[PDB]
Amino acid sequence: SEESLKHATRIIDEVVSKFLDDLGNAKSHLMSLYSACSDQKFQSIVIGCALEDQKKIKRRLETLLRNIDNSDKAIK
């Protein structure tokens, strides 16, 4: 029993840690795109956009980062 507990916990801990890793990549991927405004192929696409649309893009990235921060926060 004592050993089984730690085993089941390990199996669950892996699924969660993996999810948190994926949550971490999307977050850094989102940050790299953001700094590409405020990563390399995105930056080059951003300049071809009109300033108004560059404002929207940045804003969207900001909002997304807040959203994914709440996603991380959801995992207690």
Considering the complex, state which of residue 38 and residue 74 has its C-beta at the smaller distance from a second copy: 74
For residue 35, the minimal CB distance to a second copy (Å) is: 14
Q: Is 70 in the site for a second copy (CB under 8 A)?
A: yes
Q: How many residues bind a second copy (CB under 8 A)?
A: 44
Quick count: other Cβ atoms within 10 Å of Cβ 43?
13
Residue 33 CB burial class (10 angstroms; 0-12, 13-18, ≥19): buried
Residue pair 71/19 in contact (Cβ under 8 Å)? The answer is no
Q: Which residue has the tokens 């696409």?
A: 45
For residue 28, the minimal CB distance to a second copy (Å) is: 10
Q: Is 40 in the site for a second copy (CB under 8 A)?
A: no
Tokens of 18: 């993996």
Answer for which of 35, 55, 59, 60 binds a second copy (CB under 8 A) is 60
